[PDB]
């Protein structure tokens, strides 16, 4: 995957957080952990995580 | 005859008759919902219908974005 191929798929913030390089994704050996889950779309998973996080953070820190 | 009459419903995946429960399980269509699983025996047929619907809508989007 080239850099312009990556930036056509992901958002601008997700691309800018990783590339601070040499125009290539270079993951190391001890960097990633593989966790299995149910196949769901990314926006639905982020919506459920946002919902549980806002229901957790309501009594402890409202601001 | 009664045994084969029950086995006819068994062999077509209509065992675990919860279709009336399954259609009331599809009332929640709120924002982000899954299949809300009922049956298991007919799931091959539902999956083949899902894949053909995905191919149909890919071709329909390719026609709409072109004509």
Length of chain B counted residue by residue = 67
The Cα A27–Cα A32 span in angstroms is: 8
Give A-chain residues touching B34 at CB under 8 angstroms.
38, 40
Contacts of A6 (CB under 8 A, 6+ apart): A15, A25
Chain gaps in chain B, named by the residue before each (C–N > 2.5 Å): none
**Tokens (6 digits) for A28:** 């190391």
Q: Find all residues with CB under 8 Å of A25, minimum gap 6, and list them.
A: A1, A6, A18
How far off is chain A from B12, nearest CA to CA, in Å? 27
Closest CA to A39 of B59, B43, B38, B35: B35
**What string of H, E and C letters represents the secondary structure of chain A?**
CCHHHHHCCCCHHHHHHHCCCCCCCCCCCCCCCCCCCCCCCHHHHHHHHHHHHHHHHHHHCCC
A to B CB pairs, distance under 8 Å:
8
Please, are residues B13 and B42 in contact by the beta-carbon 8 Å criterion? yes
Distance CA A21, CA B31 (A): 39
A37–chain B Cβ distance below 8 A for any pair: no
Q: A5-30 burial string, b = 16+ CB within 10 Å, else e?
A: ebeeeeeeeeeeeeeeeeeeeeeeee
Distance CA(B18)–CA(B35), nearest Å, equals 14
B29 contact A CB<8A: no
């Amino acid at each position: 995957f080239t850099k312009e191929q990556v930036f056509k798929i992901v958002d601008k913030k997700l691309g800018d957080r990783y590339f601070k390089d040499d125009n290539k994704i270079r993951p190391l050996k001890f960097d990633l952990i593989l966790k299995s889950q149910l196949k769901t779309e990314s926006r639905d998973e982020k919506w459920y995580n946002w919902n549980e996080l806002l229901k957790i953070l309501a009594p402890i820190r409202p601001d | 005859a009664e045994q084969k009459r029950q086995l006819l419903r068994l062999l077509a995946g209509l065992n675990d008759e919860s279709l009336g429960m399954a259609v009331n399980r599809q009332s929640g269509v709120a924002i982000a919902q899954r299949k809300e699983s009922g049956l298991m025996g007919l799931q091959t047929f539902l999956k083949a219908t899902d894949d053909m619907d995905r191919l149909i809508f890919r071709l329909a989007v390719s026609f709409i974005c072109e004509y």
